[PDB]
Amino acid sequence: VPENNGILISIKEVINAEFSRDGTIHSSELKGVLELRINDHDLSHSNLKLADSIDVRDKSFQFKTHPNIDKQSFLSTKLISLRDKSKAFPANDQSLGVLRWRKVAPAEDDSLIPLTLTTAVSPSESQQGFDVIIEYESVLETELADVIFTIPVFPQEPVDINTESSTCSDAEVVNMDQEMGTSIKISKIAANDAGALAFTIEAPYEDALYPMTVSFQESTRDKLAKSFTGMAIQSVVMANDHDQELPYDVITSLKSDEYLVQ
Protein backbone atom coordinates (compact mmCIF):
# COMPACT_ATOMS: atom_id res chain seq x y z
CA VAL A 1 0.00 0.00 0.00
CA PRO A 2 1.59 3.28 -1.17
CA GLU A 3 1.71 6.30 1.16
CA ASN A 4 -0.75 9.14 0.39
CA ASN A 5 0.03 12.86 1.07
CA GLY A 6 -3.50 14.06 0.14
CA ILE A 7 -4.19 12.98 -3.44
CA LEU A 8 -2.80 9.77 -4.89
CA ILE A 9 -3.69 8.71 -8.42
CA SER A 10 -2.92 5.08 -9.32
CA ILE A 11 -2.86 4.16 -13.02
CA LYS A 12 -2.68 0.34 -13.14
CA GLU A 13 -2.43 -1.69 -16.30
CA VAL A 14 -2.46 -5.48 -16.72
CA ILE A 15 -1.01 -7.00 -19.87
CA ASN A 16 -1.92 -10.38 -21.34
CA ALA A 17 0.12 -11.68 -24.25
CA GLU A 18 0.67 -14.90 -26.18
CA PHE A 19 3.41 -16.12 -28.48
CA SER A 20 4.25 -19.22 -30.50
CA ARG A 21 7.47 -21.01 -29.63
CA ASP A 22 9.42 -19.04 -32.25
CA GLY A 23 8.22 -15.71 -30.90
CA THR A 24 5.43 -14.98 -33.38
CA ILE A 25 2.87 -12.84 -31.61
CA HIS A 26 -0.53 -14.53 -31.35
CA SER A 27 -2.51 -11.94 -29.31
CA SER A 28 -2.50 -9.36 -26.60
CA GLU A 29 -4.99 -7.67 -24.26
CA LEU A 30 -4.26 -4.70 -22.01
CA LYS A 31 -6.62 -3.70 -19.19
CA GLY A 32 -6.47 -0.45 -17.22
CA VAL A 33 -8.03 1.33 -14.28
CA LEU A 34 -7.42 4.85 -12.91
CA GLU A 35 -7.70 4.81 -9.12
CA LEU A 36 -8.10 7.86 -6.92
CA ARG A 37 -7.19 8.03 -3.21
CA ILE A 38 -7.97 11.15 -1.17
CA ASN A 39 -7.36 11.45 2.62
CA ASP A 40 -7.62 15.22 3.37
CA HIS A 41 -11.23 16.51 3.12
CA ASP A 42 -10.06 19.93 1.69
CA LEU A 43 -8.78 18.19 -1.44
CA SER A 44 -11.87 15.96 -2.04
CA HIS A 45 -13.88 18.53 -4.06
CA SER A 46 -11.55 18.02 -7.05
CA ASN A 47 -11.28 17.43 -10.77
CA LEU A 48 -8.44 15.59 -12.63
CA LYS A 49 -7.21 16.68 -16.06
CA LEU A 50 -5.72 13.98 -18.24
CA ALA A 51 -2.61 14.44 -20.28
CA ASP A 52 -2.70 16.17 -23.58
CA SER A 53 -1.26 13.08 -25.23
CA ILE A 54 -4.25 10.70 -24.47
CA ASP A 55 -7.21 10.46 -26.81
CA VAL A 56 -10.27 9.94 -24.56
CA ARG A 57 -12.54 9.52 -27.65
CA ASP A 58 -10.47 6.72 -29.17
CA LYS A 59 -12.95 3.87 -29.15
CA SER A 60 -10.42 1.03 -29.32
CA PHE A 61 -9.82 1.76 -25.62
CA GLN A 62 -13.51 1.51 -24.54
CA PHE A 63 -13.02 4.26 -21.96
CA LYS A 64 -15.71 3.74 -19.28
CA THR A 65 -16.12 6.34 -16.50
CA HIS A 66 -17.69 5.60 -13.10
CA PRO A 67 -21.54 6.30 -13.04
CA ASN A 68 -21.05 9.40 -10.79
CA ILE A 69 -18.50 10.86 -13.28
CA ASP A 70 -19.56 13.40 -15.85
CA LYS A 71 -19.10 11.31 -19.04
CA GLN A 72 -19.60 14.28 -21.39
CA SER A 73 -16.95 16.41 -19.59
CA PHE A 74 -14.50 13.54 -19.73
CA LEU A 75 -15.05 13.35 -23.54
CA SER A 76 -14.92 17.11 -24.28
CA THR A 77 -12.17 18.38 -21.97
CA LYS A 78 -10.43 15.19 -20.61
CA LEU A 79 -11.76 16.10 -17.18
CA ILE A 80 -12.53 13.62 -14.42
CA SER A 81 -15.39 15.38 -12.60
CA LEU A 82 -18.69 14.56 -10.92
CA ARG A 83 -22.26 14.74 -12.36
CA ASP A 84 -23.42 16.55 -9.24
CA LYS A 85 -21.26 19.67 -9.56
CA SER A 86 -21.23 20.28 -5.75
CA LYS A 87 -20.68 16.65 -4.53
CA ALA A 88 -17.17 15.65 -3.44
CA PHE A 89 -15.08 12.44 -3.56
CA PRO A 90 -14.58 10.43 -0.36
CA ALA A 91 -11.83 11.71 1.93
CA ASN A 92 -11.55 8.25 3.56
CA ASP A 93 -8.37 7.19 1.63
CA GLN A 94 -10.11 4.19 0.00
CA SER A 95 -9.20 3.35 -3.61
CA LEU A 96 -11.99 4.61 -5.87
CA GLY A 97 -11.92 3.22 -9.44
CA VAL A 98 -13.15 6.10 -11.62
CA LEU A 99 -11.99 5.24 -15.11
CA ARG A 100 -11.32 1.94 -16.94
CA TRP A 101 -10.08 0.85 -20.33
CA ARG A 102 -9.27 -2.27 -22.37
CA LYS A 103 -7.42 -2.72 -25.65
CA VAL A 104 -6.48 -5.73 -27.77
CA ALA A 105 -4.04 -6.37 -30.56
CA PRO A 106 -4.06 -9.30 -33.09
CA ALA A 107 -1.44 -11.72 -34.43
CA GLU A 108 1.95 -10.15 -35.34
CA ASP A 109 1.15 -6.82 -33.62
CA ASP A 110 3.58 -5.72 -30.94
CA SER A 111 2.07 -2.39 -29.94
CA LEU A 112 0.90 -3.59 -26.50
CA ILE A 113 3.80 -5.81 -25.68
CA PRO A 114 6.35 -4.63 -23.07
CA LEU A 115 8.52 -7.80 -23.27
CA THR A 116 8.89 -9.90 -26.42
CA LEU A 117 9.81 -13.57 -26.10
CA THR A 118 11.30 -16.34 -28.27
CA THR A 119 12.24 -19.92 -27.38
CA ALA A 120 14.63 -22.55 -28.77
CA VAL A 121 14.90 -26.19 -27.77
CA SER A 122 17.43 -28.88 -28.72
CA PRO A 123 18.17 -32.08 -26.72
CA SER A 124 20.86 -32.30 -24.00
CA GLU A 125 23.79 -34.56 -23.07
CA SER A 126 23.78 -33.66 -19.32
CA GLN A 127 20.20 -34.75 -18.37
CA GLN A 128 17.28 -36.89 -19.72
CA GLY A 129 15.78 -33.75 -21.31
CA PHE A 130 16.36 -30.48 -23.18
CA ASP A 131 18.65 -27.46 -23.54
CA VAL A 132 16.34 -24.38 -23.48
CA ILE A 133 17.14 -20.78 -24.56
CA ILE A 134 14.52 -18.12 -23.79
CA GLU A 135 15.36 -14.84 -25.59
CA TYR A 136 13.69 -11.64 -24.32
CA GLU A 137 13.72 -7.91 -25.15
CA SER A 138 12.20 -5.17 -22.99
CA VAL A 139 10.93 -2.06 -24.73
CA LEU A 140 10.25 -0.42 -21.36
CA GLU A 141 12.07 2.68 -20.05
CA THR A 142 12.56 1.34 -16.49
CA GLU A 143 14.24 -1.94 -15.40
CA LEU A 144 12.23 -5.03 -14.52
CA ALA A 145 13.34 -6.67 -11.30
CA ASP A 146 12.78 -10.31 -10.39
CA VAL A 147 11.20 -11.61 -13.53
CA ILE A 148 10.11 -15.24 -13.06
CA PHE A 149 10.00 -17.80 -15.90
CA THR A 150 7.88 -20.91 -15.12
CA ILE A 151 8.30 -24.14 -17.08
CA PRO A 152 5.43 -26.50 -16.36
CA VAL A 153 7.53 -29.65 -15.51
CA PHE A 154 8.42 -30.94 -12.02
CA PRO A 155 11.59 -32.88 -12.71
CA GLN A 156 13.31 -35.58 -10.65
CA GLU A 157 16.82 -34.21 -11.33
CA PRO A 158 17.43 -30.56 -10.33
CA VAL A 159 17.60 -27.98 -13.15
CA ASP A 160 20.98 -26.79 -14.39
CA ILE A 161 21.26 -23.15 -15.40
CA ASN A 162 23.83 -22.51 -18.08
CA THR A 163 25.77 -19.67 -16.42
CA GLU A 164 27.73 -19.08 -19.71
CA SER A 165 24.86 -18.19 -22.12
CA SER A 166 22.45 -16.49 -19.69
CA THR A 167 22.70 -12.63 -19.83
CA CYS A 168 21.88 -12.06 -16.15
CA SER A 169 23.64 -15.14 -14.78
CA ASP A 170 23.01 -14.86 -11.03
CA ALA A 171 19.68 -16.26 -12.43
CA GLU A 172 18.52 -19.02 -10.17
CA VAL A 173 15.97 -21.79 -9.75
CA VAL A 174 13.71 -20.55 -6.88
CA ASN A 175 11.36 -23.49 -6.71
CA MET A 176 10.20 -26.73 -8.22
CA ASP A 177 6.68 -27.74 -7.47
CA GLN A 178 4.46 -30.68 -8.38
CA GLU A 179 1.52 -28.50 -9.52
CA MET A 180 3.03 -25.04 -10.21
CA GLY A 181 6.17 -26.40 -12.00
CA THR A 182 9.71 -24.96 -12.15
CA SER A 183 10.38 -21.26 -11.65
CA ILE A 184 13.52 -19.43 -12.60
CA LYS A 185 14.10 -15.88 -11.32
CA ILE A 186 16.36 -13.44 -13.05
CA SER A 187 17.08 -10.30 -11.04
CA LYS A 188 17.09 -7.61 -13.73
CA ILE A 189 15.97 -7.04 -17.24
CA ALA A 190 17.30 -3.59 -18.02
CA ALA A 191 15.43 -0.91 -19.98
CA ASN A 192 15.34 -1.37 -23.81
CA ASP A 193 17.75 -4.38 -23.50
CA ALA A 194 17.78 -7.85 -25.10
CA GLY A 195 18.88 -10.78 -22.94
CA ALA A 196 18.63 -14.53 -22.79
CA LEU A 197 18.11 -17.24 -20.21
CA ALA A 198 19.81 -20.54 -21.04
CA PHE A 199 19.32 -23.72 -19.04
CA THR A 200 18.75 -27.48 -19.19
CA ILE A 201 15.87 -29.43 -17.77
CA GLU A 202 14.42 -32.94 -17.61
CA ALA A 203 11.25 -33.49 -19.58
CA PRO A 204 9.76 -36.56 -21.37
CA TYR A 205 9.30 -34.73 -24.76
CA GLU A 206 9.47 -31.20 -26.27
CA ASP A 207 5.76 -30.35 -25.87
CA ALA A 208 5.89 -30.96 -22.08
CA LEU A 209 7.97 -27.79 -21.78
CA TYR A 210 4.90 -25.69 -22.74
CA PRO A 211 3.26 -23.40 -22.00
CA MET A 212 6.16 -21.33 -20.63
CA THR A 213 4.90 -18.41 -18.58
CA VAL A 214 6.64 -15.25 -17.45
CA SER A 215 5.74 -13.06 -14.49
CA PHE A 216 6.77 -9.38 -14.12
CA GLN A 217 5.85 -5.99 -12.57
CA GLU A 218 6.90 -2.34 -13.17
CA SER A 219 5.91 0.45 -10.80
CA THR A 220 6.88 4.19 -10.98
CA ARG A 221 5.78 7.06 -8.63
CA ASP A 222 6.02 10.51 -10.27
CA LYS A 223 3.71 13.43 -11.25
CA LEU A 224 4.70 13.03 -14.93
CA ALA A 225 4.69 9.22 -15.11
CA LYS A 226 3.06 7.80 -18.27
CA SER A 227 1.39 4.37 -18.33
CA PHE A 228 2.49 1.85 -20.96
CA THR A 229 -0.42 3.00 -23.27
CA GLY A 230 0.15 6.74 -22.53
CA MET A 231 -2.26 7.45 -19.67
CA ALA A 232 -1.02 10.31 -17.56
CA ILE A 233 -2.24 13.29 -15.45
CA GLN A 234 -1.81 16.91 -16.63
CA SER A 235 -3.05 18.50 -13.43
CA VAL A 236 -5.51 18.29 -10.53
CA VAL A 237 -7.71 21.27 -9.82
CA MET A 238 -10.44 22.63 -7.47
CA ALA A 239 -13.79 21.50 -8.90
CA ASN A 240 -15.17 25.03 -8.27
CA ASP A 241 -12.15 26.87 -9.78
CA HIS A 242 -9.92 25.43 -12.60
CA ASP A 243 -7.03 27.91 -12.10
CA GLN A 244 -6.63 26.86 -8.46
CA GLU A 245 -4.24 23.88 -8.70
CA LEU A 246 -3.96 21.15 -6.03
CA PRO A 247 -0.99 18.98 -4.89
CA TYR A 248 -0.97 15.24 -5.88
CA ASP A 249 1.23 12.31 -6.82
CA VAL A 250 0.77 9.64 -9.49
CA ILE A 251 1.80 5.98 -9.49
CA THR A 252 1.79 4.10 -12.81
CA SER A 253 2.12 0.30 -12.92
CA LEU A 254 2.28 -2.56 -15.37
CA LYS A 255 1.99 -6.19 -14.35
CA SER A 256 1.60 -9.31 -16.44
CA ASP A 257 -1.26 -11.75 -16.13
CA GLU A 258 -1.56 -14.39 -18.85
CA TYR A 259 1.82 -13.89 -20.49
CA LEU A 260 3.04 -16.97 -22.16
CA VAL A 261 4.52 -18.98 -24.94
CA GLN A 262 3.22 -22.28 -26.29
Partner: peptide, 5 residues
Protein backbone atom coordinates in the same frame (compact mmCIF):
# COMPACT_ATOMS: atom_id res chain seq x y z
CA UNK B 1 -18.29 -3.33 -11.29
CA UNK B 2 -18.21 0.04 -9.43
CA UNK B 3 -17.87 1.12 -5.73
CA UNK B 4 -20.92 3.21 -4.74
CA UNK B 5 -20.44 6.66 -3.18
Amino acid sequence: KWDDF
